[PDB]
Amino acid sequence: QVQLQESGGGLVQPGGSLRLSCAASGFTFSNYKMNWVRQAPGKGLEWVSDISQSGASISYTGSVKGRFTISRDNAKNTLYLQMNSLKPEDTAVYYCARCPAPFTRDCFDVTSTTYAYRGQGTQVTVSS
Amino acid sequence: QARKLVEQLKMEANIDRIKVSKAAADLMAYCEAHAKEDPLLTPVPASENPFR
Amino acid sequence: EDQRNEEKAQREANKKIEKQLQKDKQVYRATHRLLLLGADNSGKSTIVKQMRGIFETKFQVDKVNFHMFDVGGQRDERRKWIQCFNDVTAIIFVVDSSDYNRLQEALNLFKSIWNNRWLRTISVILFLNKQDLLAEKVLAGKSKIEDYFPEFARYTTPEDATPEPGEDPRVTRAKYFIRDEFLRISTASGDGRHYCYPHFTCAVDTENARRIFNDCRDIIQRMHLRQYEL
Amino acid sequence: GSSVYITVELAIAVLAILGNVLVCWAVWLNSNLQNVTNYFVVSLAAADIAVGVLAIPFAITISTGFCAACHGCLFIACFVLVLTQSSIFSLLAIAIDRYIAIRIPLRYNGLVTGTRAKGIIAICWVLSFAIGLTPMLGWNNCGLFEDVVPMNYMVYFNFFACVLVPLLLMLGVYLRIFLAARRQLKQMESTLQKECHAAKSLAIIVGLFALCWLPLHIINCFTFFCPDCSHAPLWLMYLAIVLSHTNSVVNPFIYAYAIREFRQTFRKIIRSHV
Amino acid sequence: DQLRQEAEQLKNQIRDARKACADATLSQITNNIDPVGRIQMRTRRTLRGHLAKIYAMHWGTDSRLLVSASQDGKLIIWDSYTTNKVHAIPLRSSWVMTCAYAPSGNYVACGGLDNICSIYNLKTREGNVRVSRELAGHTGYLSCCRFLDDNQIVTSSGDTTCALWDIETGQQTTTFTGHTGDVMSLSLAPDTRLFVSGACDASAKLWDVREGMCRQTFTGHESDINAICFFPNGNAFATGSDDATCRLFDLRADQELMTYSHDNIICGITSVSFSKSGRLLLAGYDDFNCNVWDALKADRAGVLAGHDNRVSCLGVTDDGMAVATGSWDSFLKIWN
Ligand SMILES: Nc1ncnc2c1ncn2[C@@H]1O[C@H](CO)[C@@H](O)[C@H]1O
């Protein structure tokens, strides 16, 4: 019943813009804390960003500090992550992961290819 | 990989179903039939109840 | 009646069971339990030279027994079997210092542990191993912290630093930067219910037992003071 | 003509009994209150029950009028002394338990056992009995409470040993406790506010005990050491007595009520009572 | 890619089939049935002696003997009728997550993070209780192993795999696989020809013990599934999700018949059981109390408060006489 479809993405020249969306259904979207997680080819998963219930608290990883924007909209059950000025090493499978506990901000959702409520993926690559 | 999941979905597809109204009626009839023998619902005197 | 003989036997068995259970309870209160944690291959199984879920250790210091457990057999998923340690003395956290790539994962895991609802009232003795390796990497200069942490460009050594003899300003600054980055998560919002005890250790350290002994004594004293309302 | 202070004594007795039964039933009505540390608190509560319900009527019954034909009613005096000393030694035992728990936290769990606590209670109670029943051995001056009991004993041995040494031990113990608390507070736990708050709490308990107990001993020692100087007006003596007895009323107000769990339990106790 | 499209089409077809099957609602059908009434079950016993938090317990077949286990590492056989420690067993590993009572009343099992739930003999001729068999082979931590027969035992571990063993040989005889996430609890059928299991992937599955294969799947919960119990007639069952809601399922209709959730409750569930008559549903929440739900109307029948800490386990005797609930305060309280 829990479905998380991640649209958007595509081939873009280095330094270009983009936008990603994660369509979700099957649960009250506003009662969970969303995260974006990426897995570089030939490597494991890793956290990227997150967002609180109403969008007050935000966070980012080191390499994306100031270059990525996460935006949430509860009134439509959608979640965006605006990407600007991406570099060559930004290519990786991107996922839209929700940790299970509602009304809490604490969770382990970067499991090694075993997590259950993780979107299938959205490939994005940078090329000349 | 996904072939097992596809096969499982195919097997689950062939499942004869019953009217939900009939299912509700069956459950209600069962609860009504096994009514007078409900100690938790129906309190009993101390002699028949061992307080344990 | 002639059926109360079974009752007499039952009473005797109950008395024996309670007599043994009293000793068992006394010993169980006496023992102190600790939970070990840290990323794989980070000196986790070698923090203590052993000079005294699956893996357990038994070391005694100054006639005090300590029970440390190493959950190293279960799968990667953690949000369910972690709750089975919500009543331990403290959680030992071991994180390497020279792996800048896994350091961020370590921060995130530590933050989640800190914020966990069922572990809201447990303090952690934070460790930072591989200080010698960090010093070697910093002196080599091949990598750089700024390539992972932009905020490091605007960080300075704290005024309360206590550098070891000959410690380079660069290495000391990096060490205390990582320490502060760890401590910020805990100090963010805890309400004073629990705290952390950062340290600077190495694979060759042999006094870790003394440090954890002092830390557990301090935390238990703090709990005893929290009761009685100061 | 009135001596209405007797009414104040009855009020003190009833209030002490009420508070002590409150704390005892609170201990009964929770499993977390049965701690080894709470054993000494309940022992103190029982001591105050006894002192109130027996001594407080006893004190006025002995002071109102003393028929010397009784050939020595020193048993009542010895009993009241026993009860007072029981309360004092329960206080001292609580203080020593606290000091151990805060000075050796690791081994405290393995050093304070149920059997050891019960033995401590037994030894303190028998010490109270021995102290308060000393006069009958022959130290009594028979071969008013003032007349019946010798002043020399009450000023030389009983007062000194059983009321100064305990106070000094309490002072040292609480000084060490405050030092440790301040050291922990300044480490990583605003600033001087909480330090002063805890210091005020400890000083308030110690000073309350001192104010409650010293006055009467001071006046009695002055009377003993002042053969020429006469006694003080009887309303001062009754004031001292009511202090020494309302100490029983106030101990739980300091000890039990201040406990967060105890004061949370009391809310439902009074709610059910109403 | 093609497999993904086929799976999506199959899921859409199944959803459409269920929607077509649905015709009415349980509340509307049973609206004309009077409420049970405010029930005020009062504690009749209190069982003491367990040092640490208590995780699981199991009733005996006679409704007079039951077993409990706690993190302290002890197994105790109580006697509700007369509070007595019938037997005490110290485990080799102090960590344990479940306990079981053989229907014959001659064996018990208990396991945990050690990845094993072993076998204890209670009819020893020597008179001393000792471990008879320990079953190894599971990968993850053992979450629940429930007895099926004096020689057959079922299990569900931390590796997303149930298992049917054979104690006399101690060899896995069938492997149940197909669950994405962790497996928490299972409930055998009264006909002992099936059993349904819940997992930490917002799903529950129905198996066949003899054939060893999933027969159906149900998904109506936002978060993981903690507890699962079987309706006494083997034609329905309900589960308690961590999302603070309990739902009732049917095998014949194959849909979520009804849900139990109120705005004032926002905590997770930890245990579920059914009263013998089948009209009362018991739920053990995470806020230190249990709630009784009018099964056929989904309205609060009453409250069962009086637990110091979290209520982990729960159960109802075979004869539907007494209800036993263990909690994190290390106390077992029996309710009339
Ligand atoms: N001089 C005294 N006169 C009356 N009561 C006294 C005297 N000294 C001690 N007591 C009694 O002994 C206890 C402690 O002073 C109290 O019960 C008190 O009333």
Side-chain angles (χ1 to χ4, degrees), chain A residues 2-4 6 8-104 106-110 115-127, chain B residues 1-2 8-9 11 13 17-18 20-21 23-26 28-31 33-35 39-41 43 45-47 49-51, chain C residues 1-2 5 7-10 12-14 18 20-23 25 27-39 42-48 50 53-104 106-110 112-135 138-141 143 145 147-150 152-158 161-166 168-179 181-190 192 194-203 205-210 212-214 216 218-222 224-230, chain D residues 1 3-34 36-66 68-69 72 74-85 87-145 147-185 188 190-192 194-199 201-221 224-225 227-258 262-263 265-270 272, chain E residues 7 17-18 20 22 24 26-39 41 43-52 54-63 65-70 72-98 100-124 127 129 131-190 192 194-240 242-255 257-336:
Chain A
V2 85
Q3 68 147 3
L4 314 151
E6 40 277 30
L11 256 291
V12 202
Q13 311 289 357
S17 96
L18 200 42
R19 164 134 79 172
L20 295 181
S21 305
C22 155
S25 183
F27 58 82
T28 69
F29 192 47
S30 44
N31 313 139
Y32 301 108
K33 159 161 124 197
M34 311 295 327
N35 315 54
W36 282 94
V37 154
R38 60 192 264 272
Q39 151 174 20
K43 223 192 296 212
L45 286 289
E46 57 164 28
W47 179 71
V48 156
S49 160
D50 64 345
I51 185 140
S52 147
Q53 284 295 286
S54 208
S57 92
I58 303 167
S59 313
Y60 292 93
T61 192
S63 154
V64 316
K65 279 216 81 196
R67 320 217 318 279
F68 290 166
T69 320
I70 220 166
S71 174
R72 174 187 224 153
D73 178 291
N74 283 296
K76 282 155 50 49
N77 213 289
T78 325
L79 154 54
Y80 322 101
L81 172 148
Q82 204 302 313
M83 160 151 28
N84 284 352
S85 88
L86 47 78
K87 331 333 303 173
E89 72 282 34
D90 276 319
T91 184
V93 284
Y94 284 11
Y95 306 82
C96 161
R98 156 184 95 74
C99 35
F103 314 117
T104 85
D106 40 17
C107 48
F108 324 109
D109 91 355
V110 294
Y115 189 88
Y117 315 72
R118 204 160 55 193
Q120 203 46 73
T122 281
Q123 170 51 287
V124 305
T125 86
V126 194
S127 149
Chain B
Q1 30 166 6
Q8 153 58 16
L9 266 299
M11 307 334 159
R17 322 205 186 291
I18 296 72
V20 291
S21 305
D26 181 310
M28 171 182 62
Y30 184 110
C31 273
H34 297 0
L40 256 288
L41 206 161
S47 44
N49 161 38
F51 305 124
Chain C
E1 53 205 29
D2 287 13
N5 52 301
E7 172 281 340
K8 313 212 164 272
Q10 208 180 80
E12 191 278 283
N14 171 342
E18 301 295 70
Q20 188 57 39
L21 181 140
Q22 218 69 78
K23 318 191 286 175
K25 150 181 211 283
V27 155
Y28 161 86
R29 304 321 310 300
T31 301
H32 275 289
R33 281 145 277 110
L34 297 155
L35 162 53
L36 190 53
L37 258 169
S42 60
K44 201 157 65 52
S45 195
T46 48
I47 56 185
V48 73
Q50 212 170 15
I54 278 280
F55 263 107
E56 43 288 7
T57 72
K58 314 290 285 197
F59 74 71
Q60 81 84 58
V61 69
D62 287 338
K63 266 161 280 171
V64 188
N65 249 34
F66 285 104
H67 211 186
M68 191 162 347
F69 309 112
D70 157 69
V71 55
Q74 299 316 299
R75 259 164 69 260
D76 83 327
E77 301 257 12
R78 192 178 289 108
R79 78 191 169 285
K80 281 299 187 303
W81 65 260
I82 199 78
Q83 296 170 30
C84 291
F85 288 77
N86 77 66
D87 50 334
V88 287
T89 70
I91 308 143
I92 293 148
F93 210 133
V94 192
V95 53
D96 78 344
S97 38
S98 36
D99 182 341
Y100 325 94
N101 306 302
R102 266 190 302 110
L103 174 52
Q104 182 38 85
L107 288 323
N108 236 331
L109 165 57
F110 165 85
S112 34
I113 278 174
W114 194 256
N115 183 294
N116 183 272
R117 174 71 180 200
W118 303 124
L119 320 181
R120 253 181 160 91
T121 61
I122 299 79
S123 39
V124 310
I125 198 173
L126 192 151
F127 275 12
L128 284 132
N129 197 346
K130 323 222 88 76
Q131 300 296 343
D132 42 26
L133 312 197
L134 175 138
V138 153
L139 294 180
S143 185
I145 274 281
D147 319 57
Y148 312 86
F149 297 79
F152 177 67
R154 214 287 304 155
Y155 183 83
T156 172
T157 316
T162 181
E164 50 82 3
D168 180 293
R170 306 199 286 292
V171 301
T172 55
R173 181 158 165 263
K175 290 163 25 175
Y176 283 97
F177 166 46
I178 272 184
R179 197 265 275 285
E181 178 49 44
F182 268 132
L183 277 177
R184 167 155 52 264
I185 298 284
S186 49
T187 49
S189 42
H194 56 315
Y195 306 91
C196 321
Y197 299 152
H199 275 248
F200 297 124
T201 180
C202 320
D205 251 359
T206 169
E207 313 77 323
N208 269 8
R210 178 56 39 61
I212 40 153
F213 164 93
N214 291 1
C216 48
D218 178 312
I219 178 53
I220 284 299
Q221 167 183 119
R222 259 178 154 144
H224 277 334
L225 257 162
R226 171 58 71 204
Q227 103 180 357
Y228 311 142
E229 308 73 80
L230 306 139
Chain D
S3 60
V4 84
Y5 298 120
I6 70 199
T7 81
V8 197
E9 291 262 24
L10 330 172
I12 290 182
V14 55
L15 307 149
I17 299 333
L18 270 190
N20 275 270
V21 298
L22 286 195
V23 295
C24 186
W25 258 6
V27 173
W28 191 346
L29 265 49
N30 193 6
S31 100
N32 307 48
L33 299 174
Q34 330 159 93
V36 194
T37 205
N38 313 140
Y39 293 359
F40 295 88
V41 176
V42 61
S43 159
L44 151 63
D48 325 289
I49 285 292
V51 84
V53 86
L54 272 40
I56 302 297
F58 275 35
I60 208 64
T61 52
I62 180 55
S63 71
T64 174
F66 187 70
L74 77 149
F75 169 60
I76 299 283
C78 283
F79 140 71
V80 292
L81 262 57
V82 152
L83 271 284
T84 48
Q85 295 300 334
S87 64
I88 292 303
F89 277 18
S90 275
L91 253 188
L92 164 58
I94 292 167
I96 217 172
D97 156 16
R98 205 90 46 80
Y99 173 58
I100 294 271
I102 298 292
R103 190 93 280 161
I104 305 293
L106 290 201
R107 311 233 291 272
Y108 158 64
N109 241 23
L111 257 299
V112 154
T113 72
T115 179
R116 291 153 109 78
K118 296 185 141 178
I120 288 284
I121 293 301
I123 181 64
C124 73
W125 256 121
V126 66
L127 256 284
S128 207
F129 270 16
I131 271 180
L133 270 304
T134 321
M136 293 164 156
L137 168 60
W139 238 247
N140 96 77
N141 210 347
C142 188
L144 310 165
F145 168 93
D147 287 283
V148 305
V149 52
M151 321 305 188
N152 72 326
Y153 153 81
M154 205 37 267
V155 164
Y156 210 129
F157 168 66
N158 182 326
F159 149 74
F160 154 82
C162 319
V163 175
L164 286 204
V165 158
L167 205 162
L168 272 41
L169 291 198
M170 262 172 45
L171 210 77
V173 154
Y174 280 56
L175 153 63
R176 296 292 294 280
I177 273 167
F178 164 75
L179 287 191
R182 151 169 88 114
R183 184 66 278 158
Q184 283 322 329
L185 198 73
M188 56 139 75
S190 64
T191 73
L192 305 177
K194 293 168 299 323
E195 176 168 297
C196 266
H197 208 92
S201 149
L202 306 199
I204 221 72
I205 173 65
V206 153
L208 200 46
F209 159 78
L211 151 68
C212 261
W213 280 98
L214 279 307
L216 192 170
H217 288 321
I218 274 279
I219 168 155
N220 162 292
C221 88
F224 162 84
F225 264 120
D228 50 338
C229 265
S230 289
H231 82 88
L234 260 282
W235 60 20
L236 261 290
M237 307 280 303
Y238 285 129
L239 159 48
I241 298 279
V242 297
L243 262 305
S244 270
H245 290 152
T246 184
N247 170 287
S248 311
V249 165
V250 278
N251 332 111
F253 165 37
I254 295 299
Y255 263 59
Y257 162 93
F262 263 110
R263 65 184 223 158
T265 59
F266 294 143
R267 194 41 161 181
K268 274 310 319 193
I269 289 280
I270 67 101
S272 156
Chain E
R18 281 175 208 211
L26 270 282
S27 207
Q28 326 323 324
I29 277 160
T30 71
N31 64 19
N32 52 29
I33 281 298
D34 90 9
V36 298
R38 191 212 72 110
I39 329 301
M41 291 86 98
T43 303
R44 305 301 210 260
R45 288 268 204 296
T46 285
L47 293 92
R48 56 188 73 264
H50 263 254
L51 319 187
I54 278 174
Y55 291 127
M57 48 68 58
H58 201 231
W59 279 109
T61 294
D62 55 55
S63 322
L65 299 151
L66 93 175
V67 68
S68 265
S70 43
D72 49 18
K74 194 79 83 203
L75 244 197
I76 299 312
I77 309 286
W78 301 73
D79 179 333
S80 34
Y81 282 0
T82 172
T83 307
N84 303 57
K85 315 300 172 31
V86 188
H87 276 96
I89 317 165
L91 319 186
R92 181 53 268 202
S93 167
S94 159
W95 300 108
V96 60
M97 201 158 297
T98 205
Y101 211 161
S104 188
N106 326 116
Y107 298 105
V108 296
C110 85
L113 293 206
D114 41 358
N115 300 336
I116 298 163
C117 95
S118 35
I119 288 327
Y120 292 129
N121 183 308
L122 297 181
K123 299 310 305 304
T124 168
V129 174
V131 80
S132 182
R133 202 56 49 99
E134 81 305 350
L135 303 184
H138 259 311
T139 281
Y141 71 94
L142 202 148
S143 79
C144 156
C145 75
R146 192 125 301 179
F147 262 100
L148 185 100
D149 170 292
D150 266 10
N151 216 326
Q152 291 346 292
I153 170 170
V154 170
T155 308
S156 309
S157 166
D159 47 23
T160 82
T161 283
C162 322
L164 154 59
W165 303 74
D166 176 349
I167 310 114
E168 161 58 353
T169 61
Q171 274 286 342
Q172 276 213 348
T173 282
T174 301
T175 311
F176 309 76
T177 82
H179 258 295
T180 309
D182 216 336
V183 199
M184 319 316 277
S185 55
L186 61 70
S187 97
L188 274 44
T192 185
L194 316 89
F195 71 85
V196 317
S197 159
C200 283
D201 54 19
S203 49
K205 301 186 172 291
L206 194 146
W207 310 88
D208 177 350
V209 311
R210 286 141 209 190
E211 189 164 334
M213 61 76 68
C214 158
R215 282 263 195 72
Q216 258 299 281
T217 302
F218 318 93
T219 68
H221 280 294
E222 312 316 349
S223 80
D224 307 296
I225 300 313
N226 306 88
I228 197 149
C229 184
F230 225 140
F231 200 68
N233 92 318
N235 290 358
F237 68 126
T239 42
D242 165 291
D243 80 335
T245 293
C246 273
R247 298 189 156 84
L248 175 60
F249 284 115
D250 175 296
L251 304 183
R252 256 87 187 191
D254 212 287
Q255 312 189 19
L257 271 294
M258 190 49 47
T259 80
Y260 311 109
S261 93
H262 194 20
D263 307 14
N264 74 327
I265 58 200
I266 80 167
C267 47
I269 292 96
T270 39
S271 75
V272 178
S273 211
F274 259 109
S275 88
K276 175 247 194 158
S277 165
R279 174 57 177 276
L280 294 210
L281 167 55
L282 278 64
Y285 288 53
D286 267 334
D287 58 343
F288 324 135
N289 68 347
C290 299
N291 286 243
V292 197
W293 293 87
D294 177 2
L296 274 48
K297 267 173 99 80
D299 294 30
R300 295 291 294 101
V303 180
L304 255 66
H307 258 286
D308 177 21
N309 208 344
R310 199 159 143 205
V311 55
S312 66
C313 62
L314 182 138
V316 171
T317 62
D318 222 302
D319 58 11
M321 181 56 28
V323 189
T325 82
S327 167
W328 271 13
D329 50 314
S330 89
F331 285 143
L332 259 75
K333 282 174 53 152
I334 320 304
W335 317 61
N336 95 79

